[PDB]
Ligand SMILES: *SCCNC(=O)CCNC(=O)[C@H](O)C(C)(C)COP(=O)(O)OP(=O)(O)OC[C@H]1O[C@@H](n2cnc3c(N)ncnc32)[C@H](O)[C@@H]1OP(=O)(O)O
C-alpha cells in the first residue's frame with residue numbers, strides 16, 4: 001500500500017546521491033540520518049561542520065559527506081562554473097563569490113557538475129526561489145521544452161487511474177501554458193508517470209467538452225494541444241478533449257468517446273491552466289480524500305525539488321526518494 | 332435524494348404552478364401524476380388533450396390543467412408578445428405565429444406573463460432548445476447579468492461546506508464568462524444557495540492563488556470579479572482570490588487567509604471558467620463520490636429548467652420541486 005513506500009523501496013536500490021543544503025535546520029539532519037539508516041541514498045550535507053556538530057546530537061551523519069562552499073577543495077571550479085553561465089547578466093566574476101556561498105546554489109552546482117544526482121531543499125527557505133538557482137545552473141533536459149510541476153494523486157478505495165493513482169499537471173507552477181506547453185507538459189508528464197508509477201500512461205487532455213461536445217476558444221486550445229501531442233509522441237496514448245468522466249469512466253467513455261485510446265482508462269490529467277490544475281488537485285485531496293505528493297518538478301536536467309515550509313523529517317526523506325527515482329531517468 | 336427530499340417537502344407548502352411542455356413523453360406524464368398525487372405542484376400540461384389522455388393510460392392527470400397552444404384563449408396575445416419581444420432581430424409577425432406554436436416556447440411565455448411560476452422540460456430534448464426561449468422570452472431577472480448553470484454538490488462523510496453540501500457555478504453552461512459575468516454569477520449563486528440549501532452563503536472566488544500568493548492575468552481577473560461582486564452585494568460574505576484548501580479547510584484558512592469572512596467555511600464555489608467549473612464538479616462526483624444535482628439554471632426572471640436524456644420520472648418529479656423552491660424567491 002502506498003506510492004511513497006514503493007518509491008523509497010526503489011530508491012534503496014538505485015544508489016543515487018542527493019545534496020541537502022539546509023543543514024542549519026534540524027529535520028534535514030534527521031532525514032539524512034534516516035536516509036542512510038535505510039540505504040535510501042548516499043547524501044552530501046552542504047553546510048558547516050562546526051554548525052552541524054551542535055545540531056546533529058544523538059544522530060549519525062558519519063556515512064554522509066560534508067561539503068563547505070567556502071572551504072571545499074573544488075571551490076574555484078564551482079565559481080568558474082557559475083560565473084560562465086551568469087556572466088551574460090553583467091554580473092562580475094567575484095559576484096560569483098556571493099551566490100555560490102549559498103549551500104543551495106553550491107548544492108545545485110554539485111549536481112550539474114556531476115558530483116551529485118539531485119538536490120532537495122525548501123523546508124524553511126523559500127518555495128519560488130529554489131527553482132531559479134535550479135533554473136540558473138541546471139535548466140531543462142532534452143525533449144523538455146520547458147519544465148513543469150506535477151502532483152501524484154492517490155485516491156483511496158479507487159479503481160480508476162492506476163489503481164487509484166494519477167499524475168496531475170501542471171497543478172503547481174506554470175500558470176498560463178501555451179497550446180505548445182500544454183503539449184509539452186503532456187509528453188513530459190507521460191514519461192514522469194511511467195517512471196514513477198510504473199504503469200502505461202494514458203493521457204486525458206481535460207476540458208468541459210468531450211470530443212466535439214462544445215466549441216470555444218478554450219476547447220480549441222485543447223484539441224490543438226491533444227493533436228500536436230498525439231503527434232510529438234505518437235507511440236504515447238493521448239486523447240482529448242475529454243471531460244473527467246469520459247477520461248476515467250469506461251461506461252461513459254463507451255458512449256461519449258468510442259474507439260478512444262485513453263477515454264475510460266486515463267491515469268494522467270493535463271490541465272488547460274493552473275486555475276484548473278490547482279483547483280482540481282485540491283478538490284481531489286480535500287473532498288475525495290486523495291493522498292497528494294507534490295509539487296514535484298519535472299523537465300529539469302537533474303532533478304532539483306523544492307519543499308514546503310511546514311513538513312517533517314519523514315517527508316524530506318520521501319522527497320529525496322522521489323528525486324532518486326527521477327535521477328534514474330538518465331542512466 | 333436528501334437534498335431533494337428537503338426540497339420536495341418545501342415544494343408542498345409553497346403551492347406553486349409549473350408548466351410541463353414535454354407532453355409526448357410518458358415520463359413527463361408519470362412525473363406530473365406523481366407530482367399532483369404528492370401535492371408538490373400544480374401542473375399545466377401544454378399539449379393536445381386527446382393525445383395526452385390517450386398516452387396517459389390510467390395515470391390520474393385529472394387535477395392538471397391542459398393547455399393547447401393551437402386553441403388557447405391567449406394564443407394571439409402570446410404571439411404578439413413574442414413578436415414585440417423579438418421583432419428587432421428580424422422576426423416578423425408571421426415568423427412569430429410559427430415559432431410560438433412550439434409547446435416549450437408557449438410554456439415559457441406562460442411563465443413570463445404570470446399564468447405559471449416556472450417550466451421544466453428537455454428530458455428527451457436538447458437543452459439549447461429549452462434555454463433559447465427561456466432567455467429570449469423570460470430573460471434575466473431584473474434586466475441583469477445572464478442565465479448561468481449551477482450544480483448542488485453533496486459530498487458524503489464530509490463536514491465542509493454545509494454538512495458536505497456545496498453550490499458550484501458555473502459548472503455546466505457559461506463557457507468564458509467575463510469578469511462581470513463571474514461577479515454576477517457569485518451574487519446570484521449566493522442567493523440561489525441560501526434559498527435552496529437554507530444556510531448562510533460563504534462565497535469563494537476560486538483560483539490557484541490565495542490572497543496574493545501569486546500574480547498573473549488569471550489572478551487579476553479573479554480579484555476584479557471579487558471586488559465587483561463586493562460592490563454589487565456588500566452584505567454577502569464573498570472573498571477571493573482563494574484556493575480551494577483556503578476556501579474550506581479551517582487550518583489552511585488561518586495561515587493563508589486569516590480574518591476572511593469566507594475562508595475556512597466556504598459553501599459556494601465560483602469558477603474562473605467552465606473548464607475549471609466542469610472539471611471540478613466531475614472530480615467531486617466521480618472521485619469524491621459526491622451526489623451532484625444539475626445543471627440547474629439560475630438568473631432568469633422566472634425559473635425555467637432543462638432536463639436531460641437519462642432522467643427518470645422521479646428525476647423529473649424532483650426537478651419540478653427544485654423549480655418550485657426557485658420560484659419562492661418572489662414569496663419573500
Ligand atoms: S514537505 C511535505 C508537505 N506535504 C506534501 O507534499 C503533500 C502535498 N502538498 C500539499 O498538500 C501542498 O503543497 C501544501 C504544502 C500542503 C500546501 O501548498 P499550497 O497550496 O500553499 O501551494 P500549492 O500546493 O498550491 O503549490 C504552490 C506553492 O508551492 C510552491 N512552489 C511553486 N512551484 C513549486 C515547485 N515547482 N516545487 C516546489 N514548490 C513549488 C510555492 O510556494 C507556491 O505558492 P505559495 O506562495 O507558497 O502559496
Ligand SMILES: *SCCNC(=O)CCNC(=O)[C@H](O)C(C)(C)COP(=O)(O)OP(=O)(O)OC[C@H]1O[C@@H](n2cnc3c(N)ncnc32)[C@H](O)[C@@H]1OP(=O)(O)O
Pocket residue numbers: 208243245457458459462479480502503504609623624625626627628636637638639641642643646647
Ligand atoms: S435527471 C438528472 C440529470 N443528471 C444529474 O443531475 C446528475 C448530475 N449531472 C450529470 O451527471 C450530468 O449533468 C450528465 C447530463 C449526466 C452528463 O452530461 P455531460 O457529462 O455531457 O455534461 P455536463 O454535466 O458537463 O453539463 C452540461 C450539459 O448540459 C446541458 N446544459 C447546458 N446548460 C444547461 C442548463 N442550464 N440546464 C440543464 N442542462 C444544461 C448542455 O447541453 C451540456 O450538453 P448536453 O448534451 O446538451 O446535455
